[PDB]
Amino acid sequence: MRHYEIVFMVHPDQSEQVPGMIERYTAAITGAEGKIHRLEDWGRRQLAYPINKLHKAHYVLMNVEAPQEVIDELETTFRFNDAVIRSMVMRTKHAVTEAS
Amino acid sequence: EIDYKDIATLKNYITESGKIVPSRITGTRAKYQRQLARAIKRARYLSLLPYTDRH
Amino acid sequence: SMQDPIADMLTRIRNGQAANKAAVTMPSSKLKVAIANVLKEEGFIEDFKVEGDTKPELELTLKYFQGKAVVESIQRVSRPGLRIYKRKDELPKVMAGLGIAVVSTSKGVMTDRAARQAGLGGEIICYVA
Amino acid sequence: IKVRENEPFDVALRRFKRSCEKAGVLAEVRRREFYEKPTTERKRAKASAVK
Amino acid sequence: AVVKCKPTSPGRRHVVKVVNPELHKGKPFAPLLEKNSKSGGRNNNGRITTRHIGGGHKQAYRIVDFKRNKDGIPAVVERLEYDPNRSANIALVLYKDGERRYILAPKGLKAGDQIQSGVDAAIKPGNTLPMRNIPVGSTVHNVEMKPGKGGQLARSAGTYVQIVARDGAYVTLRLRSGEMRKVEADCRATLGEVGNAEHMLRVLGKAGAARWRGVRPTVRGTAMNPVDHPHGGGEGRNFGKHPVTPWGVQTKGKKTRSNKRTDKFIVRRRS
Amino acid sequence: SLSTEATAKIVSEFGRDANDTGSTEVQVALLTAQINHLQGHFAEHKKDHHSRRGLLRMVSQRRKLLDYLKRKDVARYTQLIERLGLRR
RNA sequence: ACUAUGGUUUUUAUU
RNA sequence: AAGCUUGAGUCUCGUAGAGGGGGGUAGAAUUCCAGGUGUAGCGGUGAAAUGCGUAGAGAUCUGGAGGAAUACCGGUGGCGAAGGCGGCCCCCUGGACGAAGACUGACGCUCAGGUGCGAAAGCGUGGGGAGCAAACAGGAUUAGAUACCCUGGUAGUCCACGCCGUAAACGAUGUCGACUUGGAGGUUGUGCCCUUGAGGCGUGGCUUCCGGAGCUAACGCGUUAAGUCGACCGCCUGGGGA
């Protein structure tokens, strides 16, 4: 298995369609012996620039260990959800411990 | 190091114009200057730092 | 890289003379040591040592005189890709009797003086005076 | 470096040409070490006792 | 995508053909056909009204949906097909609760692909919705001017139009002609681009291969008697005259729009 | 490089004694595993320059050792073509 | 703002 | 030939890197498009004209597409058969090189023929065209302007696939390897030292200047040599014709 961070932004006018994706793909990772080390809300931040009429956004931090083809099949799952703005997949750095 | 989700210490290595501070004013070792310089750019893609600096 | 065992020997005996260095080192071989003994017997060097087992090293003690080096004329007058051979009657004269040529005979390394003494020819490997 | 305080008016005067950037502070005459002193002063003062 | 033919027979060296693995090649779906009767390019009194149409060869009609049948209902593409009367060709769709229909092809090379309809549609190509729902910068085809049995603007292969502003009951958009038009927003448009876009790469290699599909070569004006076409040449084939139609009017740069009525939709016309 | 296990599947199985690489055929067999893994570099992708050029470099390296096997190893070429599918 | 040129060629030996 | 394991290459753990391939993705402004606010200017040179605008430009809001490229990071700091290569993220991967052991046993180095490859420009069959722009159509300058200067603009620059194969490809020095001189600077590993160091002492790996022997017609080279030497390959006999 491989380790990844995954830290994503939620679109404030599509936001109700995210839990039906992420709380339902936790089975698709753990069915492959993978792990999700937090999936914690990082709250509504004001942005350093307006992303074309978007200036305040909600953040979530995942922390994951999985097969690489299950994170590739999660990328198409984030893209087909469209309420999420970048998955921000980043390699290695090992698993999080003691709540960071 | 390993994190760019917080910036309150990372901003110490950025100019008021948003560009990276030269290591010779901070005494920072060149391997860590390179890491901090790329970490400052990584934090722009999480929208925690601007790209401009036009007004 | 390294084609012949003495192509790095003659230069290291000729060089270091202006700084009057009393010693020089080089990698050691059967032919280098067989030459070092005759260069001591003819008074061109004062001592030679071998040091090692699997890739040995050779140190030569160089000879000097009042304000001067002693080995002022040393050349191969042959090349490893196009070697020089002579018959027992045809071994080369050097400085019309004031120098000596070095020959590799079927009885080892010796001067042309000593090869003609025995009645032998061979390969010519150095000219010294 | 850029403008960060004014507020209804600024010093201006050749803004950042031979003022506040390059000679003084690095280059040409290399005097008064203004680039490499200000952190050493901030390292040693500090209070350093009883406010 | 198109490919060049081998010189296995005379003249074939110059031929280019269109090939699509997802194209059915078998027969159309039999309940969704009619014969499409033709009036031959002539009125009830035997006189020519349309020319170059004589000498046709059998074509049908796929009962093609321009009437926006089953509005607000989702569907799926089952197969891709050819249509002799529209350059974008056709697709066959199966609707949510039963039955098929043929639709003007949205850009795509696949089947098993779903589509949505009305204000519950996603902002994705091939979906059909009222223009009052689409955001500025959106591309659309088959955009509709009035509800009815037909459908207007952006239907030829590879065409689309893009919307630049929205205010009240109307939207403002940029045409392929260079015209700028302000159209009614309740009208049902399809997202993205209309399919094929390779229709002008057709060669029609053999001189009989235009004829066997009902296409007629147009009769050259200079080759006629001067009293049957005013452009007719002399015995030495000499030109010596300004270009004209078979009805005596000049054509090189001469304008013909005479309407003064369709003002509501006008912003800035083509230039 | 080849994995420690895909290496062991040659250097601790194919030689004439335990962990033998002094049988010249083991130097040809390990390269026949490395060149098959380099022909495995593709999918995903086809047009990688350093792998298409490095694949031909492993052909140069195999022509070196196979010509030597039919030159200085007496008879061991006909004792190897029964164990390597060099003619598929 | 603001420019193009003009062929060819020469001068001692001697203690 | 058989043993040795000094030349050369390799694995385990490790180092730095704008080296290459395949997929994704982002901030601004020049531009284009539609409506407000409010007016006649804008544009451009040595100085101007053609032009954009006056039928509503420039500027400033409002609301969005379209295209090429990636600020800082950046350091005589790094990598790559050569050519050449700096966004940020993922999926693959060559070379070089460090510690301590284990291994092949000459496996090196050179190379005719052959087959390999691009910084720009061009060609085939189609797409896409902001910033610029052979040719093109104007204007000014002029004696004329094909040139300076200026408004627009095609092919091209971008993209998919097959061709093109070149150069001041010049780091002008074909290549592997060893020895050696006076003084500094930069820069990546590993050992040793209670770092008693606010950094050295060894040993690998890397690297820029300034002297000096030898070397040159003169500039230059200078331990990373054009110095000292040895082997493999390749090339050469006046100018113009050409």
Curated annotation (Swiss-Prot), chain A:
Entry's Gene Ontology cellular component terms: cytoplasm; cytosol; cytosolic small ribosomal subunit
Biological process, per Gene Ontology: cytoplasmic translation
Keywords: Acetylation, Ribonucleoprotein, Ribosomal protein, RNA-binding, rRNA-binding
Modified residues annotated as N6-acetyllysine in this record: K93
Modifications the protein undergoes after translation, according to the UniProt entry: 5 different forms of the protein, varying only in the number of C-terminal glutamate residues, were isolated. The sequence shown is form bS6-6, which is the longest. The first two Glu are encoded by the rpsF gene, the other Glu are added post-translationally by the RimK enzyme.
GO MF terms, alphabetically ordered: mRNA 5'-UTR binding; small ribosomal subunit rRNA binding; structural constituent of ribosome
Superkingdom of this protein's organism: Bacteria
Family of the protein in this entry: Belongs to the bacterial ribosomal protein bS6 family.
Function: Binds together with bS18 to 16S ribosomal RNA.
Known partners and oligomeric status: Part of the 30S ribosomal subunit. Interacts weakly with uL2 in one of the 3.5 A resolved structures.
Protein name, per record: Small ribosomal subunit protein bS6
Species for this entry: Escherichia coli (strain K12)
Gene name for this UniProt entry: rpsF
Residues included from the entire protein: 1 to 100 of 135
UniProtKB/Swiss-Prot annotation, chain C:
Pfam family, any one: Ribosomal_S8
GO annotation terms (biological process): cytoplasmic translation; regulation of mRNA stability; regulation of translation; ribosomal small subunit assembly
GO cellular component terms, A-Z: cytoplasm; cytosol; cytosolic small ribosomal subunit
Disulfide bonds: none
Keyword rRNA-binding: yes
Alphabetical keyword list: Repressor, Ribonucleoprotein, Ribosomal protein, RNA-binding, rRNA-binding, Translation regulation
Keyword rRNA-binding part of the UniProt annotation: yes
GO molecular function annotations of the record: rRNA binding; structural constituent of ribosome
Subunit structure: Part of the 30S ribosomal subunit. Contacts proteins S5 and S12.
Purpose of the protein: One of the primary rRNA binding proteins, it binds directly to 16S rRNA central domain where it helps coordinate assembly of the platform of the 30S subunit.
Protein family according to the UniProt entry: Belongs to the universal ribosomal protein uS8 family.
Protein name from the UniProt record: Small ribosomal subunit protein uS8
Lineage: Bacteria, Pseudomonadati, Pseudomonadota, Gammaproteobacteria, Enterobacterales
Gene, per the UniProt record: rpsH
From Swiss-Prot, chain D:
Source species, domain of life: Bacteria
Any GO BP annotation: cytoplasmic translation
Keyword hit for Kinase: no
Range of residues in the leader sequence: none
One Gene Ontology CC term in the entry: cytosol
Keyword Transferase attributed: no
Bias kind Basic residues: ranges: 43-51
Keywords from the named record: Ribonucleoprotein, Ribosomal protein, RNA-binding, rRNA-binding
Disulfide bonds, paired cysteine numbers: none
Molecular-function GO terms, alphabetical: rRNA binding; structural constituent of ribosome
Family: Belongs to the bacterial ribosomal protein bS21 family.
Function comment: Probbly involved in recognition of ribosome rescue factor SmrB in stalled/collided disomes; fusion of protein fragments to its N-terminus decreases ribosome rescue in the presence of SmrB.
Subunit structure: Part of the 30S ribosomal subunit. In stalled ribosomes contacts ribosome rescue factor SmrB.
Protein name per Swiss-Prot or TrEMBL: Small ribosomal subunit protein bS21
Species name: Escherichia coli (strain K12)
Covered residues, full protein: 4 to 54 of 71
UniProtKB/Swiss-Prot annotation, chain F:
Keywords from the UniProt entry: Ribonucleoprotein, Ribosomal protein, RNA-binding, rRNA-binding, Translation regulation
Tagged with keyword Glycoprotein: no
A GO term for molecular function: rRNA binding
InterPro entries reported in the protein's UniProt record: Ribosomal_uS15, Ribosomal_uS15_bac-type, uS15_NS1_RNA-bd_sf
Pfam families named in the record: Ribosomal_S15
Upregulating conditions: Part of the metY operon that extends to pnp, also has its own promoter.
Highest taxon of source: Bacteria
GO cellular component terms attached to this protein's record: cytoplasm; cytosol; cytosolic small ribosomal subunit
Keyword Ribosomal protein: yes
Gene Ontology BP, a term: translation
Family membership noted in the UniProt record: Belongs to the universal ribosomal protein uS15 family.
Assembly: Part of the 30S ribosomal subunit. Forms a bridge to the 50S subunit in the 70S ribosome, contacting the 23S rRNA.
Role this protein plays: One of the primary rRNA binding proteins, it binds directly to 16S rRNA where it helps nucleate assembly of the platform of the 30S subunit by binding and bridging several RNA helices of the 16S rRNA. Binds to its own mRNA, stabilizing it 5-UTR and preventing its translation.
Name of the protein: Small ribosomal subunit protein uS15
Organism of origin: Escherichia coli (strain K12)
